[PDB]
Amino acid sequence: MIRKAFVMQVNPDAHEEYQRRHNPIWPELEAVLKSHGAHNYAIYLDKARNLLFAMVEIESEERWNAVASTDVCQRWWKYMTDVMPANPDNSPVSSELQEVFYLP
Amino acid sequence: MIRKAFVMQVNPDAHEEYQRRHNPIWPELEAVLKSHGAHNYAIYLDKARNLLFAMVEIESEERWNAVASTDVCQRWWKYMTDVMPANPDNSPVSSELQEVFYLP
Ligand SMILES: C[C@H](O)[C@H](O)[C@@H](O)[C@@H](O)C=O
Ligand SMILES: C[C@H](O)[C@H](O)[C@@H](O)[C@@H](O)C=O
């Protein structure tokens, strides 16, 4: 599939709360993520830098992009603004990373 | 397997060279990485921050740790000191990330 990686940020005082909110995430959000073709979605926390390293395999660029249009992702992102920096539309501040090495 | 993620840094002026050196990496280093149980070793570059987010699945913590004792990893790391921050023993400056979310 298409390997995608990106990085987001997290509030310095919300490391524990951010993690707790993903164990588990809302069942309706999980359903939507899976329906939209995501696989092996993993997020890692860089405690010293308040950074979140995410990796996810998706079947479709467009479908993955469509998650932002769903109500559940929208309310999820609104909900998450209290623990991490977000863009005006409530999507988390994020940057796409460039794959430089891959060894199966 | 055991999912491991860590972050390293890269010199601001060596983004292109760092990537070129991994396509492909030395064949004897690949052989050693695989012999020591590494799977799906991926490294992503954060251009804005000069950061390298890496993720690798390994069969054994001890075997993975043993890679640093091999001559090839040692000469590889000595070689890489010219493009990225390194510890006195030449291993790259690195920090273990904490997995906070995982959706198969
Ligand atoms: C499930 C995942 O969290 C979501 O896909 C991301 O956009 C971000 O909100 C995570 O905190
Ligand atoms: C193959 C890989 O590069 C190695 O495992 C890391 O320690 C670092 O040197 C990479 O640049």
UniProtKB/Swiss-Prot annotation, chains A, B:
Record keywords, A-Z: Carbohydrate metabolism, Cytoplasm, Isomerase, Rhamnose metabolism
Subunit-structure text: Homodimer.
Keyword Isomerase found: yes
Gene: rhaM
Source organism per UniProt: Escherichia coli (strain K12)
Subcellular localization(s) per the UniProt record: Cytoplasm
Protein's job: Involved in the anomeric conversion of L-rhamnose.
A GO cellular-component term linked to this record: cytoplasm
UniProt pathway annotation: Carbohydrate metabolism; L-rhamnose metabolism
Main location: cytoplasm
Transmembrane segments: none
SUPFAM superfamilies assigned to the protein according to its UniProt record, in alphabetical order: Dimeric alpha+beta barrel
Annotated catalysed reactions: alpha-L-rhamnose = beta-L-rhamnose
GO terms of molecular function: L-rhamnose mutarotase activity; protein homodimerization activity; racemase and epimerase activity, acting on carbohydrates and derivatives
Enzyme Commission (EC) number: 5.1.3.32
Top-rank EC class of the record's enzyme: isomerase
NCBIfam families per the UniProt record, alphabetical: YiiL_rotase
Protein name per its UniProtKB record: L-rhamnose mutarotase
